[PDB]
């Protein structure tokens, strides 16, 4: 808001946004998030219904992981 006002001051509504965006320094997305994101494997029950092969919910030993 500050820089939009100051840019309107000298009088050098779309390109104004692209000017302000580049002219200013802001906090990036990461330092304003507060949530975490995880993935839940593909269930075998669901993969056997729509006819798909679930590589994810298949368990594995420690030797088999190459």
């Amino acid at each position: 808001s500050d820089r939009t006002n100051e840019i309107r001051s000298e009088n050098l509504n779309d390109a104004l946004r692209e000017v302000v965006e580049d002219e200013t320094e802001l906090f990036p997305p990461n330092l304003t998030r507060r949530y975490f994101l995880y993935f839940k494997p593909l269930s075998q029950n669901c993969a056997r219904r729509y006819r798909k092969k679930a590589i994810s919910s298949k368990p594995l030993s420690v030797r088999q992981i190459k």
Binding site: I7, L12, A15, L16, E18, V19, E23
Partner: peptide, 25 residues
């Protein structure tokens, strides 16, 4: 000039050329 181009629509450093009318050694 950066603002002027963006609002009036790869810019190198601009050259300053000085012209004067004063004492001459």
């Amino acid at each position: 000039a950066k603002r002027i181009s963006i609002l009036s629509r790869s810019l190198p450093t601009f050259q300053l050329i000085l012209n004067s009318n004063a004492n001459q050694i």
